[PDB]
Amino acid sequence: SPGIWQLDCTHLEGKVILVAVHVASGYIEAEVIPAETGQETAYFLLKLAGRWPVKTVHTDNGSNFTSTTVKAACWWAGIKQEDGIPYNPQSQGVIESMNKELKKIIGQVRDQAEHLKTAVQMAVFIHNHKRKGYSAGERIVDIIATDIQ
Amino acid sequence: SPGIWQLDCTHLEGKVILVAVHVASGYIEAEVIPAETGQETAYFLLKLAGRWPVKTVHTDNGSNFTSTTVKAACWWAGIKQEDGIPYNPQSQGVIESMNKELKKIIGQVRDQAEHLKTAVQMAVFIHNHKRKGYSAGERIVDIIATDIQ
Numbered sequence: 001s002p003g004i005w006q007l008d009c010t011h012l013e014g015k016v017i018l019v020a021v022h023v024a025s026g027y028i029e030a031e032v033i034p035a036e037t038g039q040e041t042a043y044f045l046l047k048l049a050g051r052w053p054v055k056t057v058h059t060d061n062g063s064n065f066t067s068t069t070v071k072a073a074c075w076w077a078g079i080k081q082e083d084g085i086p087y088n089p090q091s092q093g094v095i096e097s098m099n100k101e102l103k104k105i106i107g108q109v110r111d112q113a114e115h116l117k118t119a120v121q122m123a124v125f126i127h128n129h130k131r132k133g134y135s136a137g138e139r140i141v142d143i144i145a146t147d148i149q
Numbered sequence: 150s151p152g153i154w155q156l157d158c159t160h161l162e163g164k165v166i167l168v169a170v171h172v173a174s175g176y177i178e179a180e181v182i183p184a185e186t187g188q189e190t191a192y193f194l195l196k197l198a199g200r201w202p203v204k205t206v207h208t209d210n211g212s213n214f215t216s217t218t219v220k221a222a223c224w225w226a227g228i229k230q231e232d233g234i235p236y237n238p239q240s241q242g243v244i245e246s247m248n249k250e251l252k253k254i255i256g257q258v259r260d261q262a263e264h265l266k267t268a269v270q271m272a273v274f275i276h277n278h279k280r281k282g283y284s285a286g287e288r289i290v291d292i293i294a295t296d297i298q
């Protein structure tokens with residue numbers, strides 16, 4: 001579980017927000033892209049895996065699972081590329097709730113930036129720092145450090 | 150020390166590579182930008198601080214120290230913005246060595262991507278995973294987890 005991430009794609013303002021969620025902690029990374037291509041997804045995963053020890057990524061849809069560009073990046077970065085079938089139905093609900101939460105936060109900050117990308121990064125910050133008591137940012141570090149040691 | 154980062158700006162292919170170094174671990178994040186503006190720097194810090202618990206940033210030059218856009222992002226993200234004066238002369242040498250190391254890695258991967266940005270993310274990955282024995286990626290997580298406890 002320390003190395004398992006889930007991709008998630010949501011839409012706002014006619015743009016796409018691509019999110020990676022560290023399953024065990026709820027920590028997220030996100031970016032705004034014009035559209036969700038294999039190339040955009042590949043580059044996002046390359047960034048993610050240089051920053052965290054990404055063992056497995058559950059892709060967000062079948063196009064990204066199929067994409068040879070995505071497969072090439074997963075090969076490059078040593079990531080096991082997996083499907084995102086919610087064999088546990090709870091997963092489906094967790095991601096939906098997360099997208100709702102992120103959109104709520106983006107609304108709360110939207111007037112503090114001209115560009116959506118900036119608002120999205122503010123929302124990532126708020127999400128990862130929120131105490132629920134530990135934050136998701138605290139949980140991911142604890143989980144990974146425990147795994148190392 | 151768990152929360153101290155240093156900014157660093159280097160050039161390649163007529164573009165700018167903006168780097169943040171976690172001083173205690175040598176872990177890095179980096180991006181390619183057309184030029185090093187206050188706005189680009191501010192956005193980079195916003196991203197960094199949503200991902201790691203950034204307490205203090207030593208800015209890379211006086212323009213970024215002065216920039217009201219950079220100051221606004223540091224205010225937003227709760228970062229103490231500081232100068233980057235190398236009171237310890239070892240700091241200069243460490244950064245110079247790191248830029249040289251990064252450029253070496255970029256050269257080693259350069260033909261594996263059309264775009265410089267991709268090569269830079271590959272270099273970040275290699276740098277952070279390199280065992281010198283622990284990697285910078287392991288050291289940063291251990292340092293931060295120890296601090297949380």
Ligand SMILES: CN(Cc1ccccc1C(=O)NCC1CCC1)Cc1ccc2c(c1C(=O)O)OC[C@H](CCC(=O)O)O2
Pocket residue numbers: 111112113114115116117118119186188189190191192195218221222225
């Ligand atoms: C310049 N504005 C002014 C602004 C405009 C409108 C409302 C509030 C503000 C304001 O001052 N907000 C408080 C700031 C935000 C953190 C503290 C903010 C900003 C900074 C860096 C960026 C931005 C933006 C943006 O407006 O979205 O957009 C993407 C860009 C990408 C990098 C590049 O392209 O250079 O980096």
Ligand SMILES: CN(Cc1ccccc1C(=O)NCC1CCC1)Cc1ccc2c(c1C(=O)O)OC[C@H](CCC(=O)O)O2
Pocket residue numbers: 037039040042043046069072073076260261262263264265266267268
């Ligand atoms: C498509 N190429 C093909 C290629 C071209 C030349 C040499 C090797 C390859 C090749 O297959 N390399 C191995 C791959 C690389 C990891 C495994 C790679 C690539 C993927 C995503 C990107 C890229 C690039 C790029 O070429 O730099 O550029 C930035 C872009 C940004 C996001 C967006 O704008 O969509 O994301």
Ligand SMILES: [Cl-]
Pocket residue numbers: 128129137138198199200201202
């Ligand atoms: Cl955090």
Ligand SMILES: [Cl-]
Pocket residue numbers: 049050051052053277278286287
């Ligand atoms: Cl790593």
